[PDB]
Design a binder for this molecule. Structure first.
Ligand SMILES: Nc1nc2c(ncn2[C@@H]2O[C@H](COP(=O)(O)OP(=O)(O)OP(=O)(O)O)[C@@H](O)[C@H]2O)c(=O)[nH]1
Ligand SMILES: [Mg+2]
Length: 190
């Protein structure tokens, strides 16, 4: 997509933006680079703020791209890993009351294997039959030669449906860019 502005920081539906526009929201361990992915697709450095390595994103952030879509940035599973569950109620409601939600891009790190939270997430995300675009990120930190031994583990771990799709990615080198935008567009222009 020949592709960039914030709109709001909703903590509940009584805040979600207006317009009834389409949205793709992200789910990911904390620090995984969800805030980064978002930026990588619409070509921004820190529109969605990134951080050294903490738990910087802390609210559902809506980013209207070309006034045609909505990327929604989300805190990592549980921000400060009680607050665990506090996190769910929110992502859940949303992913069960936001009809425009046109799919969830769940991002996991390629290097390691999906943490149960990721299987969990995906599971839930699947119980509601929400289309998902898994993203093996930070490819660039894995010897190009071993991206199969790593990305095979995911598929098995998250045992990803055949309807859903895994994609290798880099917020550094931008690898997986378009693939993302393609799948993301299948979901939008379905
Ligand atoms: N080398 C590398 N670093 C990455 C990559 N993606 C994200 N990072 C680094 O990881 C850190 C956190 O990235 P973010 O995008 O803020 O993380 P996040 O998952 O959105 O974090 P929260 O908003 O707290 O959930 C930063 O220092 C980024 O520069 C990637 O593909 N390669
Ligand atoms: Mg984030």
């Amino acid at each position: 997509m020949k592709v960039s502005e914030i709109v709001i920081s909703a903590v509940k539906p009584e805040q979600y933006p207006e317009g009834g526009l389409p949205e793709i929201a992200l789910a990911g361990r904390s620090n995984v680079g969800k805030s980064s992915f978002i930026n990588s697709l619409i070509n921004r450095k820190n529109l969605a703020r990134t951080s050294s390595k903490p738990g910087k994103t802390q609210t559902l952030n809506f980013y209207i791209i070309n006034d045609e879509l909505h990327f929604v940035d989300v805190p990592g599973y549980g921000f400060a890993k009680s607050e665990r569950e506090a996190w769910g109620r929110m992502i859940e409601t949303y992913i069960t009351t936001r009809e425009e939600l046109k799919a969830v891009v769940q991002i996991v790190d390629l290097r390691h294997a999906p943490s149960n939270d990721d299987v969990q997430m995906y599971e839930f995300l699947k119980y509601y039959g929400i289309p998902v675009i898994v993203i093996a990120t930070k490819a660039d930190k894995i010897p190009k030669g071993k991206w199969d031994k790593h990305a095979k583990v995911v598929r098995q771990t998250l045992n990803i449906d055949p309807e859903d799709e895994l994609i290798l990615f880099s917020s550094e080198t931008k690898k997986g860019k378009d693939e993302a935008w393609g799948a993301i567009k299948k979901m939008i222009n379905r």
